[PDB]
């Protein structure tokens, strides 16, 4: 009923799944967050920071840091926090960058504002759509997981940015 | 294990549409509105004790083909790229739910609007449709039956069966379960295995998977004539008293006279009948059905592209560059093969062979006449009613009546031992 | 009645055996043979030498329907269809349904015919659900066969059965019709010709024989056997399923050898259990008196199985640990031992709280309101303090999804006059009673986010909210059951999974010693610390001595450290017990997901649907509107639960494996689940049969073929559909010997748009649906096959098809009125006919001018010609039409064609050598027509002669439009030939298996022609009880 | 030649479905039942109810909503016909304002 | 349909044709006759309602309600329940439908 998460790039001790418990995070002043939403949010922020700070000669521990949702999509609505965080995770993995600085030590109020922006009214313009089946990469995206990694990533010649 | 869930639909027989119409569809759904007919099929053939016959379903192969046609026609609505289910109709029929439980008659507003126009020889993937991808148990439960449909619709001949010989399959639990089936016919075992498969999908190397593979190997080895009462496979064999008749019965038996020496290792092949006689033979259809119900939990070796027609090539998980070939036989010659192998082994005389061949010749005469007459009636109907254009049985040509590769498949199955 | 049906339901009778003949048609001799004649010497006939003959020896023989006239059965379905010969009146068969307003005993309402036939066909199927039994054989000691094996029938007078059952054994000394036919047959197809002899010195498993029978009931019993065979299971699978069910605390064995074939039909499909569960849930809705005994039964069983027992003194002694001085007026320990108030008889209330965990989808357990403070809570009083403590311990055990807010508000009501927090409105204020907060809408907004509570104004409530939000118990799941035989009935949760509101952890040790790492103790620790905070207050103390503040914190540490085995037991032993018990329950578990504090996910509605609305044929669209809500709350006692939580005790020496092995063993010898499965199958069969039969008389949303639309039927309404469905239900219950409810939940409504589905919805608007798949049914398919056959063989059932012509015809010719020459018939397309409808008006004649009646074209015609009438026009103007037209039909040149569609008939025979006139019969038939009923049509038919006879006049008045003489067998069966009258020989097509030598033995000719000599399979399977083959270790 | 009615009329047809919301009276019953479901749904107009009763009210309202009565059908189709048949024969002919 | 045979004649007399004004005048007289006396109008309504009860095929069976609910109280201890409350107020046991 809660989602199931996975890393495809370099999981810590081998292939594994993460299942979230039904606790919540109330530290954010105006918003309540389930555990699975909190994990997706922290990882996507990490990958955005790593994208912006990237340098061609500077290696990184992992090329992808965002989580992927593998099970339990049918329990999540399109107005919800989990679905939008999944879309944002896919965007960050593709190489997208937020148009606003991310501080090197996050605070509660900043996270509150960020979540409020995520749940603000509007629609999604980018042509990237979530699928629990696999992780889809654009034709011309500057990622390099596909050559080094064999499982979980598929590159589409017709999905281009 | 299996990673891809592709299937193939039926192809037009020169007609302008899927060869099913409203009349046949209402005949199928008279006692249950579910398109997944595989249980109701089992209630119609009546354990294979006689020659089943209906006005609209003259044979068993007719019903199998008509179930294939209905699924192929109707599953093309939810598999359009927009993935909508309740918006249009196929031959007055609409889907009840997003989860494809059954079929109902279209509401008046949809009846006013036109119907979907299906296409021949389509190949679809189960993961494309979101409601299938979301629920794995549902996907496997329906993919068993889709695998059976693909096995019928892969080539132009009859159904395809899979035979495997391996010593490490046997174990303690397999022995314990196999002892219970002593004295039962092949059809009864097939029924029970199909119901058990319906309730719970099987592990990769579970007891039931190895059990059903062993059962198929026993049936085919007895059918060819390698194994009998005086030459057993760990004391187990299949027995027919009335070889050659229109509705044969095979009984699982145990005997302590001998045990055939078996070479170590793993071997397998794909076999199929080519003559139209398969339309009236229920054991072969049930063997193909068992292979289909197995295919959901396991992965079979790929079939070569050179043994299949052009449109059925390079299917992701079914056909491949250099896979195994198909071994095709036709029924009447295989009876001579059976009698010859028995007579050479020394357990059968010449007069008994004479009687068996005479009975088989009579049976083949009757079957050929009936099938040709039904073909003529279908042609006449298609000419009279251009708005229906249906087929009651899978089409065939005269050249399929001759023998071909029968000796080769017989030799290969004997060489499996 | 409903709760008894819930606890246990009647087991249907499936397996029944027939030892007679598999036939339901009978040949009878309508007219006697003319043996002592004066052209042939009596020595010619084989009747004078007393040879028993396979067929009646008579001048006329005819086929009639008589279900099970040759059978010998061990159980009686008691639904026979018995038909009298056509020389008798058979109207009573057609006037059994909706003919309650018919006055005459001799008439029936035509518009009801299609209703009466369909029910009749159902009966025909229900009487033939049997299995053919293998009796025994003997070898022929005579040359009449080539050493054939002949079968023996139990019972008296088998010497006639031997002559009936083997037609081809008779000698042929004669050139009669019977001798010619039986000489034309083949001689090697009599008796047995297959045998499955598997073990020496035992019964052969089955045989295949040639014998007298009909193909229709052979098909029916073949389908029945196929269904029962798919239902079969073997002892090894039963052993594995029982071993899985007990989680390893029970071992049973199975034999290992070649054994005889058994029949134990118990495996069904998952959809059948789904449908049964939905039917039961709509059967139970909104009634607490129906479900309360279920929980009582489960609680008693939980006490029977479990090692934990409740010892109240474990609290009392600790309470006597400290002493308070005899110089004070209030004492904490006295308050505890007064408000807790144990008597050990309330253990049920504890167990009932656990059984409720299995049913939170239909039942909700809530704390009784009287447990709360009578006038509200004040922190200054000690009773109110400990009442808060009792409630704060007791609430987590319930399945009420609003327990956390109830606890928070129970404390907030205590602080009124001490601290304040903002509320949402003026109606639900801080002084509102906490029980009023019973829905997700009443949850206050300060509870969601902690910024709305001041840390400086209400620090205690800030801390309590934090404690609740981060330290409430977590939900969990366990595995149970054995779906390889029992399947599962889980609707919303996945099969094999049982959900709990409390986290579960298995034990590593079989000899446990006290441990406090369990979640329940951790909660109590939070509670006691929070109590200490507000007791230490200097604002609370003024009325209390400082030693009293100290003694309060002391007693808070006594209960913090009580030796309580209840918490560890729930964390480790109780889930195992629930998983063991659940598969044996007669009402299987039904749950919706537990949510901890996620208000966007609390379930707010559970609804089943049973019919559809207007112009909506798809269930997914109509479920959201047509559903009906289900559920009741249940009241529990807080003090009992709290005492049970504080005072749990294990036996002094416990080894868990031995205890559970000894406890669980007896309960697995009971086999009620194997009966429940057969009950489920029968329920699903009945539902599908109802749908298929109802679809015939009225329009519905399912696709079904329609064979009987040539039989007249009324404009059915909701009342007629309900009345038909009640008859269907009665027949279904009588056949399978059921005395309790069946299909009756469906009948409290309009049965013309039935459907079954369920849904539940969340607080945020998300809804989840279940739509079970229709599994198919064999009774409905057999009924439709009976309809297909009836479409061609209606004559054997007593029904004639078409219309009739009334008109005088006089000649000496000897043709039959059931097959008249084509020149006596006319139709609508005939040149010169007049066609009448509604607006016929008769104008009288004057001064010798002929009277006239109005055509449809507007022309007015006199009373002579060829007229076409529909039946209703004569019905609605009976007396007037008789008095106007009968003279002109009798003597004049008027001939009238009456359109009837389907009708019964009666036969009258006569001697052709004498004068015969049929006016009396036809006048009676015409005059007995009423607006709502008609009698059987009378026909006059000549008797056939085998030698010369002279001719005589005859007058006929009724003829049929088409061939309606299919129920005739041979005429003059003993003479060489028939010279005069209708001539018929024995029908070759019925005996095609014998007359055509190149046909396979298993051929059938349905639905066109019913054969009367077939190949039948007879079985000898064993049907033992499960206890006989599966044996447990004592 | 006119007789006035406060209800609509339709041609007589004995086979009309029972749950049909094209009939004004059945539709009116359905709308009232749904409004009461809205009224009781959130329990904000019923303080002082100690234990929850929303499921029981909803169940009773659903049972009353889908009931199989023929009276709205009869009033839509056959009652106007009966009134029109009786009307010309009455000793006191009708007197109606619109 | 109604029919009435006759033979041709001109000495037949069946005086029954009048105008609309005469009927309207008589109706106005009959309206003034009531004079707010209810005893004048009570019989008319009562008899017309009984005639309608005779002719109409619709019939009223209160049991349809009781089966739809299907609730029974063990005792007075079942203090508060919606289904029993509505059944008690509707009173199916009374059969006066005037």
- Chain A residue closest to C471 (CA)? A23
Residue whose tokens read 């979301």: B134
Nearest to C129 by CA among C240, C15, C293: C15
As a whole number of angstroms, the distance between CA C528 and CA C536 comes to 12
> Would the CB atoms of C441 and D14 count as touching at under 8 Å?
no
What is the gyration radius of the CA atoms in chain C, in angstroms? 41
As a whole number of angstroms, the distance between CA A3 and CA A93 comes to 19
As a whole number of angstroms, the distance between CA C269 and CA C259 comes to 27
Q: Please, what is the angle between helix C459-471 and helix C519-535, to 10°? A: 180
Read off the tokens for C916: 């015969």
As a whole number of angstroms, the distance between CA B153 and CA B121 comes to 9
On the 0-12 / 13-18 / 19+ scale of CB atoms within 10 A, D1 is exposed
Q: Quick check: do A and C touch, 3+ CB pairs under 8 A?
A: yes
- Chain D residue closest to E84 (CA)? D60
CB neighbours of residue C544 within 10 Å: 16
DSSP B309-332: -GGG---TTTEESS-BPEEEE-HH
**How far from chain centre, in Å, is Cα A34?**
15
The neighbouring-strand residues paired with C31 are: C60
As a whole number of angstroms, the distance between CA A81 and CA A33 comes to 8
Residues 6+ apart with CB under 8 A from B270: B160, B161, B162, B163, B303, B324, B325, B326, B327
Read off the tokens for A135: 């992780």
Residues of B in contact with A74 (CB under 8 A): 134-135
> Would the CB atoms of C596 and A23 count as touching at under 8 Å?
yes
Cα-Cα-Cα-Cα dihedral of B29, B31, B37, B39, to 10°?
Answer: -170
Element (H, E) at C194: strand C191-195
SS3 label, residue C853: strand
Could you give the count of Cα atoms lying within 13 Å of A96 in the half-sphere of its Cβ? 20
- Chain A residue closest to C453 (CA)? A29
Read off the tokens for C617: 């044929």
Facing residue for C436 by CB, picked from D15, D48, D56: D48
Read off the tokens for E56: 């109409």
Residue E75 forms contact with C (CB below 8 Å): no
Read off the tokens for A13: 């001790």
Q: Please, what is the angle between helix B136-153 and helix B282-295, to 10°? A: 140
Element (H, E) at C382: helix C382-394
> Would the CB atoms of D86 and E23 count as touching at under 8 Å?
no
Nearest to C888 by CA among C855, C852, C836: C852
B273 near B289, Cβ under 8 Å? no
Query: In degrees rounded to 5, what are phi and psi of residue C363?
Result: -125, 140
Preceding omega of C1007 cis (within 30 degrees of 0)? yes
Nearest to C105 by CA among C940, C930, C958: C930
CA–CA min distance D79, chain C (Å) = 18
- Chain C residue closest to B44 (CA)? C223
Alpha helices in A53-144 (DSSP H): 81-94, 108-118
Q: Which of residues 36-65 of D touch E (CB under 8 A)?
A: 53, 56-57, 59-60, 63-64
- Chain B residue closest to A76 (CA)? B134
> Would the CB atoms of C369 and D20 count as touching at under 8 Å?
no
Could you tell me whether strands C58-65 and C968-971 are parallel, antiparallel, or unpaired per DSSP bridges?
antiparallel
CB neighbours of residue C707 within 10 Å: 15
As a whole number of angstroms, the distance between CA C390 and CA C372 comes to 10
SS3 label, residue C624: helix
- Which of E50, E59, E68, E71 has the most D C-beta neighbours within 10 Å, making it the best mutation to test the interface with D? E68
SS3 label, residue E48: helix
For C167-193, b/e burial (b = at least 16 CB within 10 A) is: bbbbeeebebbbbebbeebeeebbbbb
> Would the CB atoms of C369 and D51 count as touching at under 8 Å?
yes
Residues of C in contact with B50 (CB under 8 A): 222, 1002, 1004, 1015
Q: Angle at the Cα of C658 (from C652 to C663), degrees rounded to 5?
A: 95
Element (H, E) at A135: strand A135-137
**How far from chain centre, in Å, is Cα C319?**
60
Residues 6+ apart with CB under 8 A from A2: A19, A20, A21, A22, A34, A35, A36, A72, A75
Q: How was this structure determined?
A: cryo-EM
- Chain E residue closest to C844 (CA)? E5
Read off the tokens for C302: 């939980």
Could you give the count of Cα atoms lying within 13 Å of C126 in the half-sphere of its Cβ? 26
As a whole number of angstroms, the distance between CA A62 and CA A47 comes to 10
- Which of A4, A22, A25 has the most C C-beta neighbours within 10 Å, making it the best mutation to test the interface with C? A22
How is residue B162 annotated by DSSP? E
- Chain D residue closest to E30 (CA)? D92
Read off the tokens for C526: 């939070």
Facing residue for C692 by CB, picked from B31, B98, B108: B31
Q: Quick check: do A and E touch, 3+ CB pairs under 8 A?
A: no
On the 0-12 / 13-18 / 19+ scale of CB atoms within 10 A, E89 is exposed
- Chain C residue closest to B24 (CA)? C705
C15 to each of C101, C135, C560, how far by Cα in Å?
40, 17, 63
> Would the CB atoms of C841 and E3 count as touching at under 8 Å?
yes
Q: Which of residues 131-150 of A touch C (CB under 8 A)?
A: none
As a whole number of angstroms, the distance between CA C570 and CA C560 comes to 18
Could you tell me whether strands C648-649 and C860-862 are parallel, antiparallel, or unpaired per DSSP bridges?
unpaired
As a whole number of angstroms, the distance between CA C618 and CA B103 comes to 9
**How far from chain centre, in Å, is Cα B278?**
10
As a whole number of angstroms, the distance between CA C676 and CA C412 comes to 50
Read off the tokens for D33: 């039942």
Facing residue for D20 by CB, picked from C432, C605, C614: C614
C1033 to each of C659, C662, C668, C1029, how far by Cα in Å?
15, 11, 11, 13
Residue B44 forms contact with C (CB below 8 Å): yes
Give all strands (DSSP E) within A44-159, no chain letters.
Answer: 68-71, 135-137, 153-155
C220 near C782, Cβ under 8 Å? yes
Residues of C in contact with A77 (CB under 8 A): 764, 766
As a whole number of angstroms, the distance between CA C386 and CA C243 comes to 47
How is residue C134 annotated by DSSP? P
Q: Which of residues 697-716 of C touch D (CB under 8 A)?
A: 698-699, 715-716
CA–CA min distance E85, chain D (Å) = 10
Query: In degrees rounded to 5, what are phi and psi of residue C522?
Result: -60, -40
As a whole number of angstroms, the distance between CA A62 and CA C246 comes to 48
How is residue C73 annotated by DSSP? B
Residues 6+ apart with CB under 8 A from C698: C716, C721, C752, D15
Read off the tokens for D21: 């919301």
Alpha helices in C736-806 (DSSP H): 744-747, 778-793
Query: In degrees rounded to 5, what are phi and psi of residue C1014?
Result: -140, 180
As a whole number of angstroms, the distance between CA C429 and CA C111 comes to 69
Residue B172 forms contact with C (CB below 8 Å): no
Dihedral sign for Cα B384, B386, B390, B395, please: positive
As a whole number of angstroms, the distance between CA B375 and CA B394 comes to 10
On the 0-12 / 13-18 / 19+ scale of CB atoms within 10 A, A59 is exposed
> Would the CB atoms of B107 and C617 count as touching at under 8 Å?
yes
A143 to each of A146, E1, E94, how far by Cα in Å?
8, 90, 82
Alpha helices in B248-295 (DSSP H): 282-295
SS3 label, residue C846: coil
B48 near B61, Cβ under 8 Å? no
> Would the CB atoms of D55 and C629 count as touching at under 8 Å?
yes
C975 near C164, Cβ under 8 Å? no
> Would the CB atoms of B182 and C198 count as touching at under 8 Å?
yes
Nearest to B48 by CA among B294, B284, B362, B361: B284
Residues 6+ apart with CB under 8 A from C289: C3, E72, E74
C752 near C760, Cβ under 8 Å? no
On the 0-12 / 13-18 / 19+ scale of CB atoms within 10 A, B36 is buried
CA–CA min distance B302, chain C (Å) = 31
C481 near C488, Cβ under 8 Å? yes
First to last CA, chain A: 34
Facing residue for B127 by CB, picked from A73, A74, A133: A133
The neighbouring-strand residues paired with C66 are: C82
C178 near C61, Cβ under 8 Å? no
Residues of B in contact with A73 (CB under 8 A): 134
**How far from chain centre, in Å, is Cα C434?**
46
Read off the tokens for E14: 């069946």
Element (H, E) at C410: helix C403-412
Query: In degrees rounded to 5, what are phi and psi of residue C357?
Result: -60, -25
- Chain D residue closest to C427 (CA)? D47
As a whole number of angstroms, the distance between CA C701 and CA C724 comes to 18
C56 to each of C46, C67, C170, how far by Cα in Å?
12, 19, 14
As a whole number of angstroms, the distance between CA B185 and CA C208 comes to 14
- Chain A with chain B: Cβ pairs closer than 8 A: 7
- Which of D10, D14, D19 has the most C C-beta neighbours within 10 Å, making it the best mutation to test the interface with C? D19
- Which of C372, C632, C718 has the most D C-beta neighbours within 10 Å, making it the best mutation to test the interface with D? C718
How is residue B90 annotated by DSSP? B
Preceding omega of B27 cis (within 30 degrees of 0)? no
Could you give the count of Cα atoms lying within 13 Å of C463 in the half-sphere of its Cβ? 14
Residue whose tokens read 């996050």: A106
B100 near B142, Cβ under 8 Å? yes
Query: In degrees rounded to 5, what are phi and psi of residue E76?
Result: -70, -15
Element (H, E) at C180: helix C177-184
Resolution of this deposited model, Å? 3.3
**How far from chain centre, in Å, is Cα C524?**
51
- Chain B residue closest to C772 (CA)? B101
Residue whose tokens read 């006013």: B112
Nearest to C445 by CA among A38, D44, A30: A30
> Would the CB atoms of A74 and B134 count as touching at under 8 Å?
yes
Query: In degrees rounded to 5, what are phi and psi of residue C34?
Result: -100, 60
Dihedral sign for Cα C412, C415, C416, C422, please: negative
SS3 label, residue D86: helix
As a whole number of angstroms, the distance between CA C742 and CA C199 comes to 44
Element (H, E) at C470: helix C459-471
B343 near B364, Cβ under 8 Å? no
The neighbouring-strand residues paired with C842 are: C853
Facing residue for C629 by CB, picked from D14, D21, D59: D59
Residues of A in contact with C766 (CB under 8 A): 77
Could you give the count of Cα atoms lying within 13 Å of B403 in the half-sphere of its Cβ? 13
C820 to each of C193, C317, C342, C817, how far by Cα in Å?
46, 107, 97, 5
Facing residue for E68 by CB, picked from D53, D63, D78: D63
As a whole number of angstroms, the distance between CA C811 and CA C951 comes to 10
CB neighbours of residue C873 within 10 Å: 15
DSSP B91-130: TTEEESSTT---EEEPPHHHHHS------SS-EEETTSSH
Residue B248 forms contact with C (CB below 8 Å): no
CB neighbours of residue C300 within 10 Å: 13
- Chain D with chain E: Cβ pairs closer than 8 A: 42
């Amino acid at each position: 009923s809660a989602g199931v998460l996975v890393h495809y790039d370099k999981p810590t001790n081998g292939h594994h799944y993460l299942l979230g418990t039904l606790t919540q995070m109330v530290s954010a002043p105006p918003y309540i967050i389930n555990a699975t939403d909190a994990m997706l949010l922290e990882s996507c922020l990490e990958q955005f920071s790593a994208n912006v700070r990237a340098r061609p000669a500077q290696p990184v521990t992992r090329l992808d840091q965002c989580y992927h949702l593998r099970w339990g999509a049918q329990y999540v609505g399109e107005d919800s926090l989990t679905y939008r965080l999944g879309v944002l995770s896919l965007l960050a993995t593709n190489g997208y960058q937020l148009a606003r600085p991310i501080p090197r030590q996050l605070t509660n109020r900043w996270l509150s504002s960020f979540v409020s922006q995520i749940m603000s009214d509007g629609v999604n313009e980018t042509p990237l759509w979530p699928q629990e089946r696999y992780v889809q990469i654009a034709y011309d995206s500057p990622s390099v997981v596909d050559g080094a990694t064999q499982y979980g990533y598929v590159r589409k010649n017709q999905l281009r940015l | 294990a299996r990673a891809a869930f592709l299937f193939k639909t039926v192809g037009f027989g020169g007609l302008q549409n899927v060869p099913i119409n409203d009349e046949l569809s209402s005949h199928l759904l008279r006692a249950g509105n579910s398109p997944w007919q595989l249980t109701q099929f089992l209630d119609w053939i009546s354990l294979g004790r006689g020659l089943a016959t209906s006005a609209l379903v003259p044979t068993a192969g007719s019903r199998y083909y008509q179930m294939s046609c209905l699924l192929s026609g109707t599953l093309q609505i939810p598999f359009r790229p927009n993935h909508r289910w309740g918006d249009i109709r196929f031959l007055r029929l609409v889907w009840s739910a997003p989860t494809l439980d059954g079929l109902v008659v279209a509401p008046p507003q949809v009846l006013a609007q036109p119907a979907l126009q299906a296409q021949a020889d389509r190949v679809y993937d189960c993961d494309d449709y979101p409601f299938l991808a979301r629920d794995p148990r549902f996907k496997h439960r329906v993919y068993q039956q889709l695998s059976a449909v693909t096995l019928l619709n892969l080539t132009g001949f009859g159904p395809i069966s899979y035979v495997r010989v391996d010593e490490d399959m046997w174990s303690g639990d397999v022995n314990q379960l196999l002892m219970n089936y002593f004295g039962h016919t092949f059809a009864e075992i097939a029924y029970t295995l199909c119901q058990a498969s319906a309730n719970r999908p099987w592990e990769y190397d579970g007891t039931y998977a190895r059990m059903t593979q062993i059962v198929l190997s026993l049936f085919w080895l007895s059918y060819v004539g390698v194994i009998h009462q005086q030459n057993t496979y760990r004391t187990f064999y299949f027995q027919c008293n009335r070889r050659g008749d229109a509705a044969e019965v095979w009984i699982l038996s145990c005997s302590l006279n001998h045990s055939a020496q078996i070479r170590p290792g793993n071997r397998s092949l794909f076999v199929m009948p080519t003559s139209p006689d398969w339309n009236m033979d229920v054991n072969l259809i049930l063997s193909s059905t068992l292979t289909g119900c197995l295919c959901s939990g396991s992965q079979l070796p790929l079939i070569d592209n050179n043994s299949v027609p052009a449109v059925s090539r390079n299917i992701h998980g079914w056909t491949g560059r250099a896979g195994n070939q198909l071994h095709g036989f036709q029924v009447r010659r295989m009876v001579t093969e059976f009698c010859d192998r028995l007579r050479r082994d020394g357990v059968m005389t010449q007069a008994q062979q004479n009687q068996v061949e005479a009975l088989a010749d009579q049976t083949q005469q009757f079957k050929r006449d009936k099938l040709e007459t039904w073909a003529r009636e279908d042609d006449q109907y298609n000419q009279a009613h251009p708005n229906s254009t249906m087929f009651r049985t899978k089409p065939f040509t005269n050249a399929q009546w001759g023998r071909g590769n029968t000796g080769a498949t017989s030799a290969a199955i004997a060489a499996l031992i | 009645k409903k709760t008894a049906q819930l606890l246990h339901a009647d087991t249907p009778r499936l397996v029944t055996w027939d030892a007679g003949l598999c036939t339901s048609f009978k040949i009878v001799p309508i007219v006697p043979a003319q043996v002592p004649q004066d052209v042939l010497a009596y020595t010619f006939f084989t009747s004078s030498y007393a040879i028993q003959s396979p067929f009646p020896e008579a001048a006329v023989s005819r086929i009639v329907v008589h279900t099970r006239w040759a059978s010998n059965v061990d159980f009686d379905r008691d639904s026979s269809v018995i038909m009298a010969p056509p020389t008798e009146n058979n109207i009573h068969l057609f006037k059994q349904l909706l003919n309650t307003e018919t006055l005459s005993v001799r008439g029936a309402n035509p518009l009801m015919f299609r209703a009466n036939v369909l029910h009749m066909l159902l009966e025909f199927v229900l009487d033939n659900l049997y299995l053919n039994r293998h009796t025994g054989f003997s070898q022929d000691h005579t040359p009449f066969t080539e050493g054939a094996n002949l079968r023996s029938l139990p019972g008296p007078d088998a010497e006639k059965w031997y002559s009936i059952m083997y037609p081809t054994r008779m000698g042929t000394p004669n050139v009669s019709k019977i001798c010619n036919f039986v000489a034309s047959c083949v001689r090697n197809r009599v008796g047995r010709f297959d045998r499955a002899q598997m073990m020496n010195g035992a019964m052969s498993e089955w045989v295949d024989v040639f014998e007298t029978s009909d193909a229709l009931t052979v098909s029916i019993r073949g389908r029945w056997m196929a269904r029962l065979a798919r239902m079969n299971i073997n002892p090894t699978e039963i052993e594995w399923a029982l071993t899985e069910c007990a989680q390893g605390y029970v071992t049973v064995t199975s034999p290992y050898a070649p054994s005889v074939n058994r029949l134990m039909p118990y495996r069904i499909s998952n959809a059948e259990r789904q449908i049964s569960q939905i039917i039961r849930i709509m059967n139970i809705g909104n009634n607490a008196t129906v479900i309360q005994p279920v929980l009582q039964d489960i609680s008693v069983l939980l006490q029977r199985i479990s090692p934990l027992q409740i010892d109240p003194t474990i609290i009392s002694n600790t309470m006597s640990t400290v002493s308070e001085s005899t110089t004070q007026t209030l004492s904490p320990a006295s308050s505890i031992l007064g408000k807790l108030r144990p008597s050990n008889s309330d253990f049920s209330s504890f167990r009932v709280a656990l059984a409720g965990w299995l049913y939170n989808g239909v039942v909700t357990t809530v704390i009784d309101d009287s447990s709360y403070p009578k006038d509200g809570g004040s922190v200054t009083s000690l009773e109110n303090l400990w009442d808060f403590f009792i409630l704060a311990l007791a609430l987590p055990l319930t399945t009420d999804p609003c327990a956390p807010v109830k606890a928070f508000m129970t404390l907030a009501n205590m602080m009124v006059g001490f601290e304040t927090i903002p509320m949402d409105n003026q109606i639900y204020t801080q002084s509102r009673r906490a029980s009023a907060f019973s829905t997700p809408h009443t949850w206050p907004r300060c509870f969601m986010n902690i910024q709305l509570i001041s840390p400086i104004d209400a620090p205690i409530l800030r801390q309590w909210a934090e404690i609740i939000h981060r330290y409430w118990p977590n939900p969990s799941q366990i595995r149970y059951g054995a779906p390889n035989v029992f399947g599962s009935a889980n609707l919303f949760t996945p099969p094999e999974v049982l959900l709990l509101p409390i986290d579960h952890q298995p034990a590593n040790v079989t000899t446990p010693t006290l441990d406090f790492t369990n979640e329940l103790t951790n909660w109590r620790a939070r509670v006691c610390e929070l109590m200490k905070n507000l007791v230490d207050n200097q604002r609370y103390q003024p009325g209390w001595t400082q030693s009293l503040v100290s003694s309060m914190r002391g007693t808070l540490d006594k209960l913090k450290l009580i030796k309580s085995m209840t918490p560890m037991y729930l964390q480790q032993l109780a889930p195992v017990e629930l998983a063991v018990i659940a598969p044996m329950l007669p009402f299987p578990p039904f749950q919706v997901p537990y949510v901890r504090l996620d208000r966007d996910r609390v379930p707010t509605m559970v609804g089943v649907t049973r019919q559809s609305r207007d112009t909506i044929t798809q269930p997914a669209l109509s479920l959201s509107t047509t559903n009906t809500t289900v559920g009741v709350p249940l009241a529990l006692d807080a003090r009992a639960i709290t005492v049970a939580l504080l005072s749990g005790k294990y036996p002094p020496d416990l080894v868990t494996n031995v205890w559970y092995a000894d406890a669980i063993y007896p309960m697995y010898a009971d086999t009620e689940v194997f009966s429940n499965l057969q009950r489920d199958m029968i329920t699903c069969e009945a539902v599908q049969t109802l749908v298929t039969l109802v679809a015939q008389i009225s329009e519905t949303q399912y696709p079904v073929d329609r064979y009987l639309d040539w039989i007249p039927s009324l404009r059915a309404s909701a009342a007629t559909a309900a009345t038909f469905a009640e008859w269907v239900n009665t027949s279904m219950k009588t056949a399978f010997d059921l005395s309790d409810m069946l299909l009756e939940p469906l009948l409290s409504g309009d049965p013309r748009m039935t459907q079954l589905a369920i849904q539940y919805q969340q607080y945020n608007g998300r809804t989840f649906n279940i739509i079970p798949e229709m599994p198919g049914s064999v009774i409905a398919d057999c009924v439709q096959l009976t309809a297909e056959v009836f479409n061609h063989e209606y004559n054997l059932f007593g029904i004639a098809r078409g219309d009739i012509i009334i008109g005088r015809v006089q000649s000496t010719h000897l043709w039959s009125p059931l097959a008249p020459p084509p020149d006596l018939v006319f139709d609508r397309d005939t040149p010169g006919v007049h066609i009448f409808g509604r607006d016929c008006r008769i104008s009288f004649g004057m001064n010798g001018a002929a009277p006239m009646i109005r055509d449809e074209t507007g022309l007015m015609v006199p009373f002579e010609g060829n007229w076409i009438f529909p039946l209703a026009l004569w019905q609605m103007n009976t007396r007037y039409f008789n008095q106007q037209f009968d003279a002109w039909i009798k003597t004049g040149e008027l001939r009238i064609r009456i359109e009837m569609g389907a009708y019964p008939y009666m036969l009258h025979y006569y001697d052709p050598r004498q004068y015969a006139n049929a006016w009396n019969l036809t006048s009676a038939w015409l005059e007995e027509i009423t607006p709502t009923s008609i009698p059987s049509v009378p026909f006059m038919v000549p008797i056939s002669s085998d030698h010369d006879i002279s001719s005589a006049p005859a007058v006929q008045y009724i003829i049929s439009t088409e061939y309606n003489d299919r129920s005739l067998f041979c005429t003059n069966s003993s003479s060489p030939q028939t010279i005069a009258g209708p001539d018929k020989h024995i029908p070759v097509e019925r005996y095609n298996i014998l007359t055509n030598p190149d046909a396979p033995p298993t051929q059938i000719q349905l639905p066109e022609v019913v054969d009367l000599y077939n190949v039948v399979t007879r079985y000898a399977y064993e049907t033992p009880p499960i206890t006989a083959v599966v044996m447990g270790v004592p």
